[PDB]
Design a protein around this ligand. Structure first.
Ligand SMILES: [O]/O=C(/[O])[C]([O])[C]([C]C([O])=O)C([O])=O
Ligand code: SF4
Length: 753
């Protein structure tokens, strides 16, 4: 047995490739067919590979992830529920990353110092719960959860789960890294099997070589536009083909990260040479040597069947830019001027922002600085404001040492703390008025409803960092840098050459400042106290147990039109301050959803009083009056971000079922976790038969069984009614979370509590 440790922080926790192969060959003697790469890593982590029913898109796989990662906006509710198990130690290597609460205001040092004082109480809670239950803690300044994971924790054939929808970034180093809600991270930290609907697999055949201004980001901007935000739901994405090798490991992580935007369970690349080189450059040459020894198990089987296959010729791919309000509205940088024209999107760029976990790598900063260098060499600074987020303290230390940070500061860039920042709305934007229509281009992933600054009128376009830099220099979406000229301060016209930069540093990466804090899981001792009077942290009161009766005469709180993402159900930005307090954060419930009745966000009719008002207040008014209610939704309800708050908040305010045409995968699992009923119309045209006024009866809950639809009676005000059927994807363990009131309660009742 090789004794090669998972990371430099867990010397004693070894990679189990032996276990993986054992289970793969068990499964493969039962399936007798080629396995894809995500099927080898996923079925190789099955708790029972000899008896697990394995069928794509149909069965619930009982799995054993190798490790759990949390970030600080979703770690507070995950540790509060983990304290409730009363387990004294986590069962797997687990980390907390403090990246989500640092607000971009004046730039890195100022900002991080501001945030450590602003967020003391929360950072203290998370460090102390981390020391107490054996969770490694990365302090504010460490970096964005996914960078730190790529540099320290992802490896070939890992199964990692993270409480973030962009955990898929770790597929850049051949692991299966899946985003989940905090209650799923609590399963694995408490030792209980994690279940995952068995994934379908989309294969993206890559061909050719990326050239010029075209970078890895453009491969996923292209696949998102092709497949749409709904195209990857319930599937893992597998890249393969000759083109794979032309992409660096952090470029493969960029392509896997924004796979989240098509609803994919996760994305992965096969173990290869550029992965090997990235491991070695990060002090993990030993993991790369063991991976070489099991590479048989870390690449797809010849002839493996993909459910969908898409092909991309990398050498014909052009620079793209997606937006302004969906990540799947794709444009070549070439024609984006004209479309903004036709469609009335602002052509002047207010702010260009490079960073986020999607595009904050050393290679990313290197190509951004290569573009900035040329502009600087002609006496130019940025026309648009320009912000730069480094992905980790190591990348800030190294780009500082290798001079990228001074070039980018010299064209007028502000380099922010190594934190999410403007990406989740942790931004004190001061250059517009609220409501001012404007355009910002970013090298981020998502571009929902100005969610960068809380201005619904901000038009955000996602692109590659080097195109963000050429466009912040030019100030307008009319600039295509592959073909347009700029005028130096010397009155001479020049065109920007395509960037070229080092994938990795020549020397060692400079680690920067000390930000890791290992659990003294020696003595431990110190207790985590949360103030009975905190406005930011509150202990979770157990949700109520099911009374065993039907859901009769349900009031419709809202019938939502169109796109209802978790940023519509539970916004971030000024709400991240309450990610540890459920009653305070429940005050954003669905304030962004569009009411079909009047097509307004946060204006629903209260049915007792007949006044139109805040969706949060109406839900508390129905709860205080004993009126149980339902949300009716459209398609891909709950798209986007991972936050289990979008499911904790409707349960907390009296919610009972969310009936939709379809759900996003993580949100639907979060709804089952919190004792709500996610249900879908057996016929989606029945959405059209429910009017905001109807009362609805969900009958047959005494007979709730796997694969059997429920009856819904739509009670119309004129006394007519009509019965429809509702399908559900509950298996018997999720039906027991329902009966008990939540999965947490089901655990406490199994724990003879
Ligand atoms: O990745 O982005 C976002 O949105 C965030 O990060 C989320 C969670 C929270 O909110 O925190 C997810 O998950 O995704
Ligand atoms: S997508 Fe943005 S808010 Fe989510 S982790 Fe990446 S940088 Fe942070």
């Amino acid at each position: 047995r090789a004794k090669v440790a998972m990371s430099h922080f867990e010397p004693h926790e070894y990679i189990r490739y032996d276990l993986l192969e054992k289970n793969i060959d068990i499964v493969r003697k039962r399936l007798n067919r080629p396995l894809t790469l995500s099927e080898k890593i996923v079925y190789g982590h099955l708790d029972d590979p000899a008896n697990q029913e394995i069928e794509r898109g149909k069965t619930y796989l009982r799995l054993r992830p190798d490790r759990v990662a949390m970030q600080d906006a979703t770690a507070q509710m995950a540790m509060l529920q983990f304290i409730s198990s009363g387990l004294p130690k986590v069962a797997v290597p687990s980390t907390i990353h403090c990246d989500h609460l640092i607000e971009a205001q004046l730039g890195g040092e100022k900002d991080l110092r501001r945030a450590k004082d602003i967020n003391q109480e929360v950072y203290n809670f998370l460090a102390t719960a981390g020391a107490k239950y054996g969770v490694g803690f990365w302090r504010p300044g460490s970096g964005i959860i996914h960078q730190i994971i790529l540099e320290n924790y992802a490896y070939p054939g890992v199964l990692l789960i993270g409480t973030d929808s962009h955990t898929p970034n770790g597929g850049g180093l051949g692991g299966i890294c899946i985003g989940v809600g905090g209650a799923d991270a609590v399963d694995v930290m408490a030792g209980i099997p994690w279940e995952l609907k068995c994934p379908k697999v989309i294969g993206v055949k890559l061909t050719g070589s990326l050239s010029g201004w075209t970078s890895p980001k453009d491969v996923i901007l292209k696949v998102a536009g092709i497949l749409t935000v709904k195209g990857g739901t319930g599937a893992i994405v597998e890249y393969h083909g000759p083109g794979v090798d032309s992409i660096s490991c952090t470029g493969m992580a960029t392509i896997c990260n924004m796979g989240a935007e098509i609803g994919a369970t996760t994305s992965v690349f096969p173990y290869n040479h550029r992965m090997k080189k990235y491991l070695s450059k990060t002090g993990r040459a030993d993991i790369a040597n063991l991976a070489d020894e099991f590479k048989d198990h870390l690449v797809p089987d010849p002839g493996c069947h993909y459910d969908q296959v898409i092909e991309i010729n990398l050498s014909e791919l052009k620079p793209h830019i997606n937006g302004p309000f969906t990540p799947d509205l794709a444009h070549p940088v070439a024609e984006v001027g004209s479309v903004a024209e036709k469609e009335g999107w602002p052509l002047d760029i207010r702010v260009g922002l490079i960073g986020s976990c999607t595009n904050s790598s050393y290679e990313d900063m290197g190509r951004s600085a290569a573009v900035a260098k040329q502009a600087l060499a002609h006496g130019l600074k940025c026309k648009s404001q320009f912000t730069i987020t480094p992905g980790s303290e190591q990348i800030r230390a190294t780009i500082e040492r290798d001079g990228y940070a001074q070039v980018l500061r010299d064209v007028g860039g502000i380099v922010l703390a190594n934190a999410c920042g403007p990406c989740i709305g942790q931004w004190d934007r001061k250059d517009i008025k609220k409501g001012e229509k404007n355009t910002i281009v970013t090298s981020y992933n998502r571009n929902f409803t100005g969610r960068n600054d809380a201005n619904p009128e901000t038009h955000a376009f996602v692109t590659s960092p080097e195109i963000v830099t050429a466009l912040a220099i030019a100030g307008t979406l009319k600039f295509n840098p592959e073909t347009d000229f700029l005028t130096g301060k010397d009155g001479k016209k020049f065109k920007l050459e395509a960037p070229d930069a080092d994938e990795l540093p020549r020397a060692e990466f400079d680690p920067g400042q000390d930000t890791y804090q290992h659990p003294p899981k020696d003595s431990s001792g110190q207790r985590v106290d949360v103030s009975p009077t905190s406005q930011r942290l509150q202990l979770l009161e157990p949700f109520d147990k099911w009374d065993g009766k039907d859901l009769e005469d349900l009031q419709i709180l809202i019938k939502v039109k169109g796109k209802c993402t978790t940023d519509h159900i539970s916004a971030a930005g000024p709400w991240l301050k309450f990610r540890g307090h459920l009653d305070n954060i429940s005050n954003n419930l669905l304030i962004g959803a569009i009411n079909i009745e009047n097509r307004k966000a946060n204006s629903v009719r209260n049915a007792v009083t007949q006044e139109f008002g805040p969706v949060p207040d109406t839900a508390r008014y129905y709860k205080q009056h004993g009126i149980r209610w339902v949300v009716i939704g459209d398609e891909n309800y709950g798209e986007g971000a991972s936050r289990e708050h979008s499911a904790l908040e409707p349960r907390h305010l009296g919610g009972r079922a969310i009936i939709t045409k379809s759900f996003a995968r993580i949100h639907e699992t979060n709804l089952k976790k919190q004792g709500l009923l996610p249900l879908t119309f057996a016929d989606p045209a029945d959405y059209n038969k429910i009017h905001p006024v109807d009362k609805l009866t969900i009958q047959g809950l005494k007979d709730f069984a796997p694969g059997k639809p429920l009856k819904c009676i739509i009670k119309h005000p004129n006394g007519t009614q009509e019965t429809i059927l509702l399908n559900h994807t509950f298996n018997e363990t999720q039906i027991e979370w329902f009966r008990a009131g939540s999965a947490l309660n089901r655990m406490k009742e199994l724990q003879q509590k």
